[PDB]
Design a protein around this nucleic acid. Structure first.
Length: 52
RNA sequence: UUUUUUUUUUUUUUUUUUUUUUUUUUUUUUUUUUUUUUUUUUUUUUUUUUUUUUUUUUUUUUUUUUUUUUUUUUUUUUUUUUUUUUUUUUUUUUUUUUU
């Protein structure tokens, strides 16, 4: 698995960004989504939260 | 084009640890890096006290003149051929951006 780890979650850095900002603040995920105050960021989050 | 911790094998997280220990203390004594004795200006022969003086003197003044380290005369941008006056310009362009 040395060398092959860079294949996992390739070109998917925004999910890791969301996880890091959830863990580094101590807030729940709903509060992290609540504290967003821009329409562009909210639209990207909505497009990133496709259910299936 | 695609990407976007010059992050990541999994584990881990004191550049901690045999055990025992803790004045880079200690033989016992001792405790002026004091002392023969007796002395105590790194004073003194007696004289003496301007590292003063022959006398005379006293601008490290002076021949007499003189007194811009001025001057042929003419002059007075260390200006000028005329023309000119971004040490601008082919056209097109205008992140020393980009699969």
């Amino acid at each position: 698995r040395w060398g092959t780890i860079v294949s996992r979650f390739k070109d998917c850095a925004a999910l890791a960004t969301l996880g890091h900002v959830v863990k580094i603040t101590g807030l729940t995920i709903e509060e992290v989504f609540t504290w967003v105050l821009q329409t562009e960021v909210a639209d990207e989050l909505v497009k990133m939260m496709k259910p299936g």
